[PDB]
Amino acid sequence: QGLQTWKLASRALQKATVENLESYQPLMEMVNQVTESPGKDDPYPYVVIGDQSSTPFETKSSFGENITMDFHVWGGTTRAEAQDISSRVLEALTYKPLMFEGFTFVAKKLVLAQVITDTDGVTKHGIIKVRFTINNNTG
């Protein structure tokens, strides 16, 4: 009953994560574009959900006991807005706690995204990588 009882439930946490993104009223006034991949050519500031680089290779399965979700945000302004888009997406992510209908997973990962201003004239973008673990998933 507890072998690989996730599968569609783990990816449905991305739907529950999309439910904190749709339930969080301050984020929608900041983006016109919270979408699950389509709308990459839509107006700035805005966000698409997926993965970064050549992360899923041959299979799209994050080892065994893990659920993985990445968010890619292009605001395109200055240093304060990159912390506001990144803090607004994580503030949504724990605004309403992550549960799916009989299934619990906890956000347990170590990452960093740095906000910087360069002399060469670079854009401000936020790349967010989140992993949720079923190991001690109390719920």
- Distance in angstroms (rounded) separating the CA atoms of residues 60 and 51: 10
Phi, psi of 80 (to 5 degrees): -70, -35
| Residues near 94 by beta carbon (within 8 Å), at least 6 away in sequence | 107
CB-based burial of residue 21 (10 Å sphere; 0-12 exposed, 13-18 middle, 19+ buried)? buried
| Residues near 96 by beta carbon (within 8 Å), at least 6 away in sequence | 19, 20, 23, 24
Question: Which experimental technique did the depositors report for determining this structure?
Answer: NMR
What is the SS3 assignment for 104? strand
Whether the CB-CB separation of 73 and 128 falls below 8 Å is answered with yes
CATH number for 1-136 (one of 3.30.70.1520, 3.30.70.3040, 3.20.20.10, 3.30.2000.30): it is 3.30.2000.30
Question: 98-101 long-range CB contacts below 8 Å, 24 or more apart?
Answer: 98/13, 98/16, 98/17, 98/20, 98/132, 99/16, 99/139, 100/9, 100/12, 100/13, 100/15, 100/16
What is the SS3 assignment for 115? coil
- Distance in angstroms (rounded) separating the CA atoms of residues 84 and 121: 20
